[PDB]
Symmetry: D2
Subunit: 259 residues, 4 copies
């Protein structure tokens, strides 16, 4: 079938990449980096993110799989030692994760695998948080972070967000160093929104914001509204053994007694 | 239909109750506190909790409704002044029902039998004097070894209660999940915990297993009873749901906004 | 000089105790009534009991702690060093290090009771919601509603205070730290959220709103005080004295406990 | 004496209103050797007045007027400008000395350090002893008076300015098995030095109050409580905690 492999750029990833293509050189597999059905990422989560955005137009036609050449990742969950076992077994069941739809208004749309953040471009960050066409709070601080379920283990976790299992179709809004005084009273707690819930970020003073989607920071000028909602689109993973989400959370933050 | 009303106990709630009973007494409504189809709580959220636990065996045949005689509650969403419009719409049967998820707490001893509990807000587990030390096993796999005050597993609707004060996230009740939060974790080299709140979906089981002490203080919606010789405490989203009678639209986030931001 | 030793209670501590006492058998006399050197064997909780056992002779006592289990913040010396400990103290070749303490004063409806804390002093309700007014230096600061409040010593910041999200303070700083316990921080009961660090001569007064019965704990000594009118917190003028031999930095001790 | 302005018309007019008063009591406007510096505007305006005279802090008593809201440095309302000139005890606050590797900086609020286009990974060395390996957004070392600013938003504690210390807070620490951090804010006394050492990237974005500068080839960033103190001119009694109350509690 049709496949392609991306690389982090270093020698370890390039070497493992070519060796797998050679491995694919022992089965009925065709290399296509234009119309693939299987995209293989080699490196880290950041590499996996780049592979996701490289083919965010064919997510319905692509099953992703990740190998971490460095530390254990949440998307790159396969070890380099299992590269032989991978080409054999793929030549399987599919697992789908939710995505975050980001809409900007001046309309531009973005898909997030991890999260979408909004900060100021040269002053204090002051916006109104509107939930389902109804005003909720006025935020002032560094910024706001709307995270995907799979992305809760990333920037979200560092910002004090909760960890949600990816089978839950939702989004999580977390504060970034919010000034919580008498003028700008915010909820403080992270907020988890279900499907069809729209979180609208509307400017108060400055209308130019620094918006990043999976760390794709672009400075949007003359912004009228930033809308957040659970995308109807989903990323598909190729599953072979059972590597539970909580196990990956455990091995990353608690301990990994066999490595 | 068959209905009943519970009261907070003060004059305002008792007075409103009798007036509503008289109101239903002008339609095809029968007062039945044994097999009701509509349970109306008058007072606060704590009052609503008592009404829920009073009828936890008939949740599938009961639509709850709450009236707050004091401050706005998350379960008590009706003002006393709308009791008249309430009786009219309940007698006509002009309402749709909305369901919230619940938390099943299972305790296991050295088999004496086995006890199960349902929570609307949350279920907490603490020590009976000394330090609280348990192993957190997620779906038959060890996750962490906890040492501290205790742990708190919350329902989606219960996230606005104890969960929020403990640093938990707020989840919309339409989401079928449960949320585990730490209660003063020591989080050191020996007892390393995740720190972050954990949100578990359906069919996920959180098993708490004792390390030294086997006596735990278990609370379900603030009903703390001392269980001795505990072998296992299991948490999972119950298949049972509490049903609410909806008339107008009072959004959860609006209820959160009005409660914590400003009103 | 005169010394005495306390034990955690288990065999490891009791055996290590007798072996050390046997070591002193130097010009050292065992006196548990008027001791000059107090040796704690077990854990920090054991050290706390030894501290409160002789809180009336703190000016004439240099404390030292041995952890038979994991490393503690007061019991910071390992059991393998029990021989070296007895030797160095018998010559009297050691300097003294002092840590600040927390004075807790309760006022009723009767007299007034005072307590000394090495770690912290906490106040919770004795049934139901905990609602008090936090008054700083005779001036109202906030109205708290939740589980309780915790006023911590500098050395005690590494204890309960840290689990509650409090900051860690170096014990050389003469101060106290107030932390919240599950505040319902809403529109009616708006709290500061942040931990508050108070200097000397600053008085934090906790005054009841409705319920007047509170659970007051001093270094985990919980007693039910009835008819409470006021709970006062301030840095005590008294200090706990440690026997220093080598250099075991506070931050190094924090590192070994939480980082490693 | 001398007077600084926020830049807007409100401050300039108010400045002129006070300056006319001083020509009747025996004080001459000197922006080279002032003994009393008057700030008109906000806390941010006060910061500029502080940084304008970091070489004469030992010979200057500061005073702030807020044309807007109650500030933590600007505690006088414009209506009390008249009472000021008549009276015009000293109160000293601790400061944060920041050393880059040699550049030295004084901070009134805080000093933060982040990366210049990637992950922020440094070794936190406390008194020549390794404490932790940090990975995240950055770190924030705050002065006692600055704890009510950026420090508070980062979850730091609020400490009374009479306490001579500094407070380190984390900025989005990943805190995993590899990069285990303390999580808790750390309050350091005098003579304690927190040394931040690079692991891979050596380019960092360092900010002092509000002077964000991109340092390349950084070998070490040292933090310690400065021996210098900022002196305030106090007339009435405005307790720090009431000021905290008025701002965040309401
Ligand atoms: N009251 N009542 N009803 C019981 C609910 O009260 C909520 N709750 C509990 S009960 C846990 C407990 O033993 N708290 C001791 C002090 C206290 C008791 C009751 C209410 C309050 Br407020 C405080 N504490 C909570 C808290 N600190 N913040 C916000 N919700 C809390 C729990 O989630 C229960 O569901
Ligand atoms: N045992 N003992 N030592 C008492 C000390 O234990 C420290 N401590 C307390 S005591 C408060 C309490 O009653 N907690 C209930 C469960 C518990 C009891 C005792 C130790 C522990 Br751990 C847990 N909780 C602490 C906590 N969660 N984290 C880190 N230090 C704590 C306090 O600072 C006391 O000074
Ligand atoms: N690679 N990469 N970057 C993409 C992911 O990095 C995650 N991430 C971001 S990106 C936000 C940012 O600009 N951070 C500046 C410092 C930094 C950048 C990238 C990684 C790290 Br670690 C630190 N910060 C994160 C954080 N502090 N903790 C744990 N994940 C973070 C985001 O969720 C992105 O998904
Ligand atoms: N000039 N000026 N501003 C600098 C002051 O702003 C205080 N401050 C900063 S600055 C951090 C930052 O880079 N924020 C994004 C752009 C920005 C510039 C100036 C002010 C603000 Br806000 C934001 N954030 C703060 C925060 N989140 N909470 C409370 N105080 C904050 C810092 O403590 C400085 O003292």
């Amino acid at each position: 079938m049709k496949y392609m492999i991306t690389s982090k750029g270093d020698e370890k990833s390039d070497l493992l990449r070519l060796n797998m293509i050679a491995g694919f050189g022992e089965y009925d597999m065709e290399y296509d980096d234009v119309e693939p059905e299987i995209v293989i990422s080699i490196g880290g989560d950041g590499t996996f993110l780049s592979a996701f955005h490289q083919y965010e137009e064919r997510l319905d036609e692509i099953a992703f799989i990740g190998i971490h050449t460095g530390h254990l990742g949440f998307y790159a969950d396969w070890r380099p030692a299992e590269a032989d076992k991978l080409v054999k077994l793929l030549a399987y069941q599919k697992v789908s994760y939710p995505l975050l739809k980001t809409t900007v208004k001046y309309e531009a749309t973005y898909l997030a695998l991890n999260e979408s953040t909004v900060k100021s471009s040269g002053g204090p960050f002051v916006v109104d948080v509107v939930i389902n066409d109804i005003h909720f709070e006025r935020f002032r601080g560094d910024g706001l972070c709307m995270s995907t379920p799979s992305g809760t283990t990333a920037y979200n976790k560092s910002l004090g967000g909760a960890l949600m299992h990816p089978s839950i179709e939702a989004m999580q809004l977390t504060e970034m160093a919010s000034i919580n005084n008498r003028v700008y009273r915010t909820i403080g707690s992270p907020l988890v929104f279900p499907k069809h819930h729209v979180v609208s970020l509307q400017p108060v003073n400055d209308k130019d914001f620094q918006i990043s989607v999976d760390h794709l920071s672009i400075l949007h000028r003359d912004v009228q509204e930033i809308r957040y909602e659970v995308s109807a689109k989903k990323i598909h993973f190729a599953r072979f053994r059972s590597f539970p989400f909580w196990r990956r959370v455990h091995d990353s933050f608690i301990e990994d007694l066999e490595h």
